[PDB]
Amino acid sequence: HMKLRSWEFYDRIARAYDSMYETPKWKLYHRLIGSFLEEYLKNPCRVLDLGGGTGKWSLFLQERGFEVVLVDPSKEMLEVAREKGVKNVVEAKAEDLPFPSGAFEAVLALGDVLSYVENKDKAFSEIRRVLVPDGLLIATVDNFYTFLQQMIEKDAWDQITRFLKTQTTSVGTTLFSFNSYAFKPEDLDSLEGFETVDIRGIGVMEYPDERISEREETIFRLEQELSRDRNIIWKADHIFFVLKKKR
């Protein structure tokens, strides 16, 4: 594997990115994320789409009358976003955001961005900085227990030992990889200057793709309910969470 920085990996695949997440599972997950955004973002306001990639969620909010800026360190992702019609795009990393303090009511960090940033402390610090008091961070991240199950399936025993300590493993494709940090419950606990508002599981159950196609509405309603159950969310494929900047 060639070891890349995250944005260098995304520079290589930007133009195929959207086509990779058009499976029944990913359609389902997008529908869930979309329903959650409409739940937490009641009214139009100022939003930073951080690591916003090809602009999926920026467009979603633009078309609902929000004032949206997309930020991303991948020049190719940004170019794809611009072509798709995202109006405000900026090249930057989460670790060092070029926006003044208190500029946004909400920051999105969807598609596991905070699992990819190289310095989580600076990243959470910058997010808190750019939000108004009581602003929300709305994010999804990789789940430690899902990674661990996957590693056990792909028989990575020399690697599990390290991973249990670091929570960090490689991700990517057959030829190119970058590092991901998979979150545990204690990672979302007493974050400095944030109140945890909600945590939810995305993909609490695994469904065969065939059944998702056959029964999308039924399965979306089930996952809606299951995502709200605290006792089971760390079973999920990915983790969604919301923080509120303390006053």
Ligand X SMILES: Nc1ncnc2c1ncn2[C@@H]1O[C@H](C[Se]CC[C@H](N)C(=O)O)[C@@H](O)[C@H]1O
Which of ligand X, a second copy, none interacts with 77 (beta carbon under 5 to 8 A by kind)?
ligand X
Q: Does 203 bind ligand X (CB under 6 A)?
A: no
Q: Closest distance between a second copy and the C-beta of residue 190, in Å?
A: 15
Instruction: Using CB under 8 A, list all residues that contact a second copy.
Output: 145, 148-149, 152-153, 155, 157, 160, 164, 184-185, 204-208, 211, 215, 218, 222, 231-232, 234-235
Stretch that binds ligand X, among 34-42, 46-54, 127-135, 181-189 (CB under 6 A): 46-54
Whether 149 and 118 have beta carbons less than 8 Å apart is answered as no
Which of a second copy, ligand X, none interacts with 18 (beta carbon under 5 to 8 A by kind)?
none
Q: Closest distance between a second copy and the C-beta of residue 170, in Å?
A: 20
The residue (of 94 and 204) whose beta carbon lies closer to ligand X is: 94
Q: Which of 61, 93, 126, 233 binds ligand X (CB under 6 A)?
A: 93
Q: Closest distance between a second copy and the C-beta of residue 35, in Å?
A: 20
List the interface residues with ligand X, window 98-127 (CB under 6 A).
110-111, 113, 116-118
Q: Which of 41, 56, 138, 194 binds ligand X (CB under 6 A)?
A: 56
